[PDB]
Amino acid sequence: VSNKQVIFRDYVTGFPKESDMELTTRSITLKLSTGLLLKNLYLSCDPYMRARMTNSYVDSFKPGSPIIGYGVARVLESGNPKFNPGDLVWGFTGWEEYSVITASLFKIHNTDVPLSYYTGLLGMPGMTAYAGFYEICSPKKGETVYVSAASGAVGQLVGQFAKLTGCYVVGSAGSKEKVDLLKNKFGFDEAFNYKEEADLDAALRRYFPDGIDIYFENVGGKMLDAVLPNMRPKGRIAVCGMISQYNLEQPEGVRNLMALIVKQVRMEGFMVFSYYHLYGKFLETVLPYIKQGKITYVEDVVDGLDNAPAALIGLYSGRNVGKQVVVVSRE
Amino acid sequence: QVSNKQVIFRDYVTGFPKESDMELTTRSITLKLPQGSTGLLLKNLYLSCDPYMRARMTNHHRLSYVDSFKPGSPIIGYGVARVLESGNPKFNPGDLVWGFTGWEEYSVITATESLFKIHNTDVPLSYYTGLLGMPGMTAYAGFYEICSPKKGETVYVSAASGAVGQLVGQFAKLTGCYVVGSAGSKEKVDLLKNKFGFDEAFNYKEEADLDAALRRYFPDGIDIYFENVGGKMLDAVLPNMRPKGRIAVCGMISQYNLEQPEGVRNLMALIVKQVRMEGFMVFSYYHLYGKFLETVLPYIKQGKITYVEDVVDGLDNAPAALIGLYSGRNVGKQVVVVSRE
Numbered sequence: 001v002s003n004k005q006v007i008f009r010d011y012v013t014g015f016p017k018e019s020d021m022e023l024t025t026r027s028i029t030l031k032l033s034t035g036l037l038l039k040n041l042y043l044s045c046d047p048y049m050r051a052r053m054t055n056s057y058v059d060s061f062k063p064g065s066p067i068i069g070y071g072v073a074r075v076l077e078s079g080n081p082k083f084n085p086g087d088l089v090w091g092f093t094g095w096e097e098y099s100v101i102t103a104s105l106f107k108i109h110n111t112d113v114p115l116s117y118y119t120g121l122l123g124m125p126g127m128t129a130y131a132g133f134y135e136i137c138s139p140k141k142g143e144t145v146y147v148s149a150a151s152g153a154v155g156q157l158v159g160q161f162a163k164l165t166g167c168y169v170v171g172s173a174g175s176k177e178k179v180d181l182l183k184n185k186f187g188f189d190e191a192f193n194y195k196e197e198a199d200l201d202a203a204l205r206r207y208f209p210d211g212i213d214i215y216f217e218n219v220g221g222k223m224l225d226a227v228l229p230n231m232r233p234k235g236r237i238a239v240c241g242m243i244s245q246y247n248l249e250q251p252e253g254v255r256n257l258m259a260l261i262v263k264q265v266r267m268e269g270f271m272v273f274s275y276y277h278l279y280g281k282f283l284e285t286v287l288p289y290i291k292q293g294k295i296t297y298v299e300d301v302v303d304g305l306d307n308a309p310a311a312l313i314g315l316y317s318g319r320n321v322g323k324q325v326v327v328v329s330r331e
Numbered sequence: 332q333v334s335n336k337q338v339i340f341r342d343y344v345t346g347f348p349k350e351s352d353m354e355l356t357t358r359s360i361t362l363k364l365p366q367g368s369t370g371l372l373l374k375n376l377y378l379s380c381d382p383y384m385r386a387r388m389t390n391h392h393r394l395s396y397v398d399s400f401k402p403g404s405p406i407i408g409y410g411v412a413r414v415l416e417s418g419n420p421k422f423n424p425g426d427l428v429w430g431f432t433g434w435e436e437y438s439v440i441t442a443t444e445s446l447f448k449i450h451n452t453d454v455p456l457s458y459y460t461g462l463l464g465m466p467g468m469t470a471y472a473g474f475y476e477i478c479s480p481k482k483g484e485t486v487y488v489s490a491a492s493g494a495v496g497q498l499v500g501q502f503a504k505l506t507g508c509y510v511v512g513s514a515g516s517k518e519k520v521d522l523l524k525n526k527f528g529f530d531e532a533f534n535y536k537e538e539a540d541l542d543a544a545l546r547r548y549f550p551d552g553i554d555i556y557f558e559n560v561g562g563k564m565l566d567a568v569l570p571n572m573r574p575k576g577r578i579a580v581c582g583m584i585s586q587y588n589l590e591q592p593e594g595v596r597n598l599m600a601l602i603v604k605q606v607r608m609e610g611f612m613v614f615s616y617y618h619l620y621g622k623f624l625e626t627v628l629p630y631i632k633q634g635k636i637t638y639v640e641d642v643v644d645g646l647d648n649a650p651a652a653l654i655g656l657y658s659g660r661n662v663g664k665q666v667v668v669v670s671r672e
């Protein structure tokens with residue numbers, strides 16, 4: 001059968017563009033070995049993928065070969081005993097209709113949620129929100145929480161977890177549509193459009209007159225400098241991402257780190273890879289909340305591999321509204 | 332009546348401080364408290380020069396943590412003094428104390444709860460401005476409460492020959508860590524290797540590429556950075572941290588005299604290396620003071636911990652000694668002796 005693929009053309013400098021990926025089709029036979037033959041259903045667009053386009057923490061993409069990243073797929077055939085034909089899995093797969101995988105995947109049991117959730121809410125981004133918030137921030141009822149990129153895959157979940165814990169939660173996002181989602185769907189206490197704030201420090205002083213106990217950091221740069229002098233004593237910054245920096249040849253300087261001393265702040269980075277032993281517990285905690293409607297999720301869903309390059313590039317302009325999903329083929 | 336020489340704060344400072352930002356005057360005073368006073372009459376013996384005092388020479392700051400100095404009034408800071416007279420039953424004449432006092436020969440103290448009563452005089456009294464006072468406590472709290480050090484881990488100490496750093500490094504050695512310090516002269520580097528027992532040490536002024544220098548001294552990276560300096564030094568450390576590394580943010584003295592702090596560019600290293608970078612203030616740790624003293628005094632007695640002070644004689648020399656911190660003039664902990672006892 002035919003197998004369209006999104007190919008990585010060549011290593012990227014600065015921002016990515018659609019020409020850095022190329023669409024192609026190849027002829028393949030659907031059989032097989034100890035590996036796995038997958039029909040790819042959904043693909044995630046995740047900000048970290050930009051780092052794999054550079055010639056730090058995982059191998060770079062290989063020019064001429066398909067983009068790889070997190071997806072949800074159906075097992076067509078297996079030469080490994082732990083997976084059988086018909087299994088649904090999430091994990092790393094290729095940007096293509098069908099992939100042969102030499103491997104680590106999670107077998108999906110609960111199918112009474114939209115399968116696309118295993119690219120986001122129930123996949124790596126949701127695990128990231130859970131680990132960063134519950135394992136790094138030591139949150140307590142009554143504490144104030146600021147979430148940057150608050151309407152995104154990770155942010156929208158951090159904010160809801162913080163509300164469930166009894167925190168006072170403010171988010172920022174880059175459009176009126178996203179700010180409305182934060183206040184009207186996700187139940188943030190307050191939210192603002194950071195692109196329309198002339199002075200970020202002023203906005204944070206208004207929304208946190210007594211300071212910020214917890215900053216869930218997704219953005220870096222200027223936003224982090226605005227946060228630092230607004231932290232409360234013994235405040236915490238969970239350093240999750242710094243997406244404002246990912247396309248710079250030279251990262252921007254952050255000037256306000258003396259605030260860490262005078263406010264005795266713990267600023268700690270983490271990688272979700274180190275928390276996957278908690279994935280079972282994460283499911284135990286979140287799947288009931290989804291059931292009882294305490295946790296909701298917004299996805300941005302585009303159809304077809306042909307649209308995956310623009311969906312990935314759109315992350316760095318804020319084009320996605322919520323978690324960016326690419327539908328290769330519905331279940 | 333006796334004379335009371337004083338160091339007066341002349342006016343608020345912009346940029347680096349200079350001698351002329353302070354004034355020396357002599358006043359007449361009577362060694363007697365007012366009737367009904369509940370305060371202390373102190374004779375000041377030793378004064379500390381400490382880097383944080385620069386912040387008090389500016390009128391106001393977003394990140395202020397204490398009131399600034401008042402122009403026309405004496406400099407205030409940590410010192411060691413003897414009680415001459417007391418309106419507070421907790422102190423009797425002849426008691427020796429350490430805590431905040433005036434840059435003068437005699438002070439009257441109203442707020443007496445910052446004062447620690449010295450019990451052990453088995454040691455030079457000057458120790459209570461440094462090793463056994465606030466800088467020593469800082470090193471103890473920052474290293475043992477913030478850094479979670481373990482045997483075999485690698486430790487980098489900036490301003491390592493200073494009041495805080497020289498103790499951090501020795502604590503690290505005693506814990507079984509591998510310790511490298513940097514300082515800004517050959518004299519200081521020699522102390523690090525030959526008196527304090529650091530595994531290695533370098534003069535950071537001799538290294539045009541600090542990141543490369545740290546790669547040479549830490550071939551497998553840094554578990555713990557005891558941060559005293561900030562700026563380019565911090566940026567050189569960040570890519571050299573190990574996974575689950577820790578930075579104890581104690582001070583950033585390279586920033587204290589700038590109108591705009593320098594930008595630190597390598598913070599994404601915190602993510603990929605899962606580093607905890609945590610600031611702290613020693614004032615939050617004085618509940619551990621008794622335990623600190625129980626720990627360090629036997630080490631001092633057994634010669635297992637040593638200390639280097641920079642000692643200048645006389646209040647006339649105090650302004651130069653404070654200014655000198657910011658160009659590295661002090662060799663070890665900067666002390667001013669007001670009256671040698």
Ligand SMILES: NC(=O)c1ccc[n+]([C@@H]2O[C@H](COP(=O)([O-])OP(=O)(O)OC[C@H]3O[C@@H](n4cnc5c(N)ncnc54)[C@H](OP(=O)(O)O)[C@@H]3O)[C@@H](O)[C@H]2O)c1
Pocket residue numbers: 046047048124125128149150151152153154155172173174175178218219239240241242243244245270271272273315316317318319320322323324602
């Ligand atoms: N440490 C880990 O293990 C880990 C794991 C996953 C993700 N992360 C990080 O978590 C963060 C969010 O990931 P996500 O999946 O949830 O992405 P996302 O929020 O769904 O999408 C990215 C968003 O970033 C915002 N953005 C882009 N450029 C920006 C800029 N220059 N300044 C400010 N905001 C900008 C946009 O939202 P606006 O419209 O609001 O601008 C955009 O929608 C990223 O930094 C990611 O790298 C970390």
Ligand SMILES: NC(=O)c1ccc[n+]([C@@H]2O[C@H](COP(=O)([O-])OP(=O)(O)OC[C@H]3O[C@@H](n4cnc5c(N)ncnc54)[C@H](OP(=O)(O)O)[C@@H]3O)[C@@H](O)[C@H]2O)c1
Pocket residue numbers: 261381382383465466469490491492493494495496513514515516519559560580581582583584585586611612613614656657658659660661663664665
């Ligand atoms: N609670 C707290 O958080 C707390 C408490 C006390 C102190 N501190 C901080 O800890 C640090 C050390 O204090 P300390 O009492 O021990 O002082 P110190 O080291 O005894 O004296 C200051 C030293 O700073 C170094 N220095 C000056 N300018 C520098 C620059 N631009 N770059 C690099 N090094 C520079 C000099 O040493 P070189 O010759 O090596 O340059 C100088 O001797 C300070 O930043 C201080 O504010 C924090």
Ligand SMILES: CC(=O)CCc1ccc(O)cc1
Pocket residue numbers: 047048124240241242271272273602
């Ligand atoms: C789930 C992952 O594998 C990566 C998460 C991520 C990590 C670092 C970063 O800078 C952005 C996203």
